Amino acid sequence: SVEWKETAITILNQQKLPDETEYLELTTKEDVFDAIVTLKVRGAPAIGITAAFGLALAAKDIETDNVTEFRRRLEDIKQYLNSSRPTAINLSWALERLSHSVENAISVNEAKTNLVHEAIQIQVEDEETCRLIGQNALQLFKKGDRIMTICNAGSIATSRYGTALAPFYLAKQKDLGLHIYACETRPVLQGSRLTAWELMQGGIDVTLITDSMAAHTMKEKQISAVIVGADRIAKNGDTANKIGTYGLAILANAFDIPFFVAAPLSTFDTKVKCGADIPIEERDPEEVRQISGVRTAPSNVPVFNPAFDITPHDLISGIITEKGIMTGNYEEEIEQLFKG
Amino acid sequence: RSVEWKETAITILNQQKLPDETEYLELTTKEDVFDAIVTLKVRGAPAIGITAAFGLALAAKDIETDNVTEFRRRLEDIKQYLNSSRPTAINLSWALERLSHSVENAISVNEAKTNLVHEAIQIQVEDEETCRLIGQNALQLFKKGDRIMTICNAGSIATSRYGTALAPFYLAKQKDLGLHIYACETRPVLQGSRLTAWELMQGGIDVTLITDSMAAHTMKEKQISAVIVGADRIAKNGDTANKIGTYGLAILANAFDIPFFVAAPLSTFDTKVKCGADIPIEERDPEEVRQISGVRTAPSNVPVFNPAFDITPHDLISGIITEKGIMTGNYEEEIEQLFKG
């Protein structure tokens, strides 16, 4: 979904799926700003990745020889791409990675080839963390069980395999007759437009359901467990995910059904105490008032449009990263985990 | 108005056209009634019955028979034809069962042929008064300036007028009390963002739209004070069957500890069952979950699960509101010591 050409970045326009597989050639630091706010590219990690190739690109365009000045401008761009979308850290996390990869550059020309290797490197280890999460999480389910998910934490949300979908892809070979239930994550339908398309495009047993049906499906389909990705995880353990995730957790807990949050180490924010202090992005009201040019509610009806909710660690049965499975006491587990 | 009986035609508002359009239709055939109902041009537990009833009567028109028992004899074929439209709502059953019972001791084909129309009008108006009564009955449950959340569209176009769950809001507007209602779009058919948001707006009712996937978060962030929905069929023990999505609002509600309320006219009841788990949950066309108003949202061919209703077990309901009053505890007996007559 994200591919780098030292001249530009070609991204799969995620808005179009499942209808068309369009590719756009982002070449300007503003073409990237837009690709993000506009959701042409989404998924905490994939988003972090393009953010990086963004600075990595707008930088060659930077003219001069003063390393100190170069880094002044570089910072304005970083604050710009970062102002794009909040709630997930993967964005500013990848940005930091880069603006530090040049805290001791002697020249500029190097610092420019520096940023790129970093960005190209951030993307390489994304395949690695995902393959791991796919493999660490699969330990949780067995042959036969039907698992639910939300949003689209798959191949195009990351680099490959994904986080919460990763195990499905793996359970496939193993021939684990895993039956998935994906919810059409409204309003942006990242679930019916991406998660159904992808999993089907790979021969996984998916079944699409509206967000509402969540509970009825849990009862009459005997859901076995729930796994979702993340956008930001606090020291506390509280996790920030697609609007709707919280409801499934509290709803899942009622059915005493396992709630898993699959997410990379880069999705954690050690600086933040709990979830309640994680800024939730509210997007354009029209995301709820119309779709593909067709109005679905009174044009001026007031709307509450939050993109993410928070799931208190009290609701999480386990957390999966490239390191393993911290099934509880996520406060401490993380301080241990975190190091370097 | 919702459903209008002429003496040779039923005029329904095409609800699948809203919110951008308000077109009406001239139903003439029992074929036309069957369609409208099944394709949701007309929906809402009561409105449905109002139509099935009227429709049946318009049917019993173009049917020649000197005989009374020959008229009745084949007069089910119609009842059955329509009753086989949509399963879940117990109002379509109830509303046909009534019409077929009020011609039992009919002495002439023209008598019944004419009693039916009177019966179907008896039913519509009765509803208005019972919607007006539930409205008042339920308004006692909310203080002023509180945030209520609903699902589906149990209002005036779903009923003859006033509604059941929405009733209390029109009335609150009257007594002027700061009610802010939160309507979840209610997918797949979207009667929430399309029907509810649109009428409450007309009536200057303070409304805010949210996708179904925002129940929980809105509950915490917005501090919603209560929840109110409206059945399609209630079981002899409190177990209510309402539009898909209600069961979770119930579970969530319980979790946030806020009152969950059901508003249903007496007819929306079905004492002849022991619980909801035994209530026929309709399942509609898959392409309903695969798109949004013509716009394909998912890859066609993607397997879909599409139940139209779910079941909220009585011990999750903080109270049921009827035209006769409120019930707060043992529903099984209360429900029993009511249909007593």
DSSP string spanning A75-93? HHHHHHHHTS--S-SHHHH
Q: Which residue in chain B has the smallest CA separation from A306?
A: B214
Count Cβ atoms within 10 A of the Cβ of residue B26 and give its class: 0-12 exposed, 13-18 middle, 19 or more buried: exposed
Contacts of B310 in chain A (CB under 8 A): 213, 215-216
Q: What's the Cα-to-Cα distance from B9 to each of B28, B57, B112, rounded to whole Å?
A: 5, 10, 18
- In angstroms, how far is CA B97 from the centroid of its own chain? 17
Distance of alpha carbon A40 from alpha carbon A194, whole angstroms: 12
User: Which residues is A269 bridged to in the sheet?
Assistant: A234
Among the partner residues B211, B222, B248, nearest to A288 by beta-carbon distance: B211
Taking a C-beta distance cutoff of 8 angstroms, is the pair A130, A159 a contact?
A: yes
Q: What's the Cα-to-Cα distance from B247 to each of A282, A305, B134, B193, rounded to whole Å?
A: 27, 23, 22, 19
In this structure, what token pair is assigned to residue A149?
């998910």
Taking alpha carbons only, the member of A244, A209, A215 closest to residue A229 is: A244
Could you identify the residue written with the tokens 């389910």?
A: A141
Q: Which residue in chain A has the smallest CA separation from B256?
A: A250
Q: What's the Cα-to-Cα distance from A291 to each of A156, A209, B189, rounded to whole Å?
A: 22, 18, 14
Distance of alpha carbon B63 from alpha carbon B338, whole angstroms: 39
Decide: helix, strand or coil at residue A218: helix
Distance of alpha carbon B217 from alpha carbon B337, whole angstroms: 39
Distance of alpha carbon B132 from alpha carbon B130, whole angstroms: 5
Are A224 and A312 in a shared domain? yes
Distance of alpha carbon B95 from alpha carbon A240, whole angstroms: 49
Taking a C-beta distance cutoff of 8 angstroms, is the pair B215, B184 a contact?
A: yes
In this structure, what token pair is assigned to residue A291?
């779709």
- Of the residues A102, A119, A139, the one at which a domain ends: A139
Question: Do B247 and A215 make contact, defined as CB atoms within 8 angstroms?
Answer: yes
Taking a C-beta distance cutoff of 8 angstroms, is the pair B212, B150 a contact?
A: no
Are A184 and A329 in a shared domain? yes
User: Which residues is A208 bridged to in the sheet?
Assistant: A182, B304
Are B311 and B334 in a shared domain? yes
To the query of whether residue B232 is one of the catalytic residues in this protein, the response is yes
The experimental method is: X-ray
Are B220 and B264 in a shared domain? yes
Residues 6+ apart with CB under 8 A from B326: B137, B138, B140, B141, B319, B320
Give the N- to C-terminal CA distance of chain B in Å, as an integer.
32
3-state helix, strand, coil in chain A (%, to 5): 40, 15, 40
| Residues of A classed as catalytic | 231
Question: Do A250 and B247 make contact, defined as CB atoms within 8 angstroms?
Answer: no
Quickly count: other Cβ atoms within 10 Å of residue B60's Cβ: 25
Decide: helix, strand or coil at residue A33: helix
Q: How many domains does chain A divide into? A: 2
Residue of A228, A283, A296, A315 to mutate when probing chain B, most B C-beta within 10 A: A296
Q: How far is A248 from chain B (nearest CA, A)?
A: 9
Q: Determine whether the annotation assigns residue B45 to a binding site.
A: yes
Taking a C-beta distance cutoff of 8 angstroms, is the pair A184, B297 a contact?
A: yes
- State the pairing for strand pair A208-209/B207-210: unpaired
CATH number, residue A71: 1.20.120.420
Are B208 and B82 in a shared domain? no
In this structure, what token pair is assigned to residue A120?
């190209």
Question: Do A18 and B296 make contact, defined as CB atoms within 8 angstroms?
Answer: yes
Are B181 and B327 in a shared domain? yes
Q: Domain range spanning residue B86? A: 1-140
Among the partner residues B193, B214, B290, nearest to A306 by beta-carbon distance: B214
Could you identify the residue written with the tokens 């530090």?
A: A100
Quickly count: other Cβ atoms within 10 Å of residue B108's Cβ: 13
Resolution in A: 2.7
Q: φ, ψ for residue A328 (rounded to 5)? A: 170, 160
Give a three-class secondary structure readout of B179-201. Answer: CEEEEECCCCCCHHHHHHHHHHH
Distance of alpha carbon B272 from alpha carbon B84, whole angstroms: 19
H or E segment to which residue B264 belongs: none
Question: Do A213 and B299 make contact, defined as CB atoms within 8 angstroms?
Answer: no
Are B133 and B152 in a shared domain? no
List b or e across B158-185, with b for residues whose CB sees 16 or more CB atoms inside 10 angstroms.
bbbbbbbbbbbbbbbeeeeeebbbbbbb
Q: What's the Cα-to-Cα distance from B131 to each of A118, A261, B5, B234, B339, rounded to whole Å?
A: 66, 46, 19, 17, 18
Cα dihedral B307, B308, B314, B316 in deg (nearest 10) = 80
Are B151 and B70 in a shared domain? no
- Of the residues B140, B164, B199, the one at which a domain ends: B140
Contacts of B214 in chain A (CB under 8 A): 243-244, 247, 304, 306, 309
The verdict on B194 touching A (C-beta cutoff 8 Å) is yes
Are B168 and B107 in a shared domain? no
Q: Where are the beta strands (DSSP E) in chain B?
A: 3-5, 10-13, 24-27, 147-151, 180-184, 207-210, 226-229, 233-235, 240-243, 260-263, 269-270, 291-292, 295-296, 309-312, 319-322, 325-327
Could you identify the residue written with the tokens 């909801």?
A: B276
For chain A, positions 235-294, list CB contacts with chain B under 8 A.
243-244, 246-247, 250-251, 254, 288-289, 291-292, 294
Decide: helix, strand or coil at residue A170: helix
Are A216 and A335 in a shared domain? yes
- Of the residues B140, B169, B200, the one at which a domain ends: B140
Q: How far is A282 from chain B (nearest CA, A)?
A: 12
Q: φ, ψ for residue A127 (rounded to 5)? A: -60, -45
The verdict on B217 touching A (C-beta cutoff 8 Å) is yes
Distance of alpha carbon A163 from alpha carbon A157, whole angstroms: 9
Distance of alpha carbon B199 from alpha carbon B203, whole angstroms: 6
Q: Tell me, what DSSP letter sits at residue A192?
A: I
Q: Directed axis angle between helix B69-83 and helix B109-139, to 10°?
A: 40
Are B338 and B198 in a shared domain? yes
CATH number, residue A252: 3.40.50.10470
Count Cβ atoms within 10 A of the Cβ of residue B284 and give its class: 0-12 exposed, 13-18 middle, 19 or more buried: middle
Are B162 and B263 in a shared domain? yes
For chain B, positions 124-153, list CB contacts with chain A under 8 A.
151
Cα dihedral A205, A207, A213, A214 in deg (nearest 10) = 30
